[PDB]
Amino acid sequence: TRRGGKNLAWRPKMSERTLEQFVPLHLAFPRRHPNSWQERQFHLLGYVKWPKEI
């Protein structure tokens, strides 16, 4: 009965029950870990940046 929102690319004519399965929860990609956190996670785990020869 709605008089707008008919762009099926954004408001598909499907139920929340049918869209729940497609709602992602363990979203593998796109990733959620910024590059700035890589060194922080490294240090938190406790590893060290040994020189290449070691």
Per-residue x/- mask for another protein, residues 1 to 40, rule CB under 8 A?
A: -xxxxxx-xxx-----------xxx-x--xxxxxxx-xx-
- In the complex, least distance from residue 39 CB atom to another protein, rounded to whole angstroms: 7
30 and 23 Cβ atoms separated by less than 8 Å: no
Binds another protein (CB under 8 A): choice among 28, 46, 47, 49: 49
Give the CA distances from residue 8 to residues 3, 11, 13, in Å, rounded to whole numbers and listed in that order: 14, 5, 7
**Which tokens hold the place of 53?**
């020869």
Closer residue to another protein (CB): 2 or 17: 2
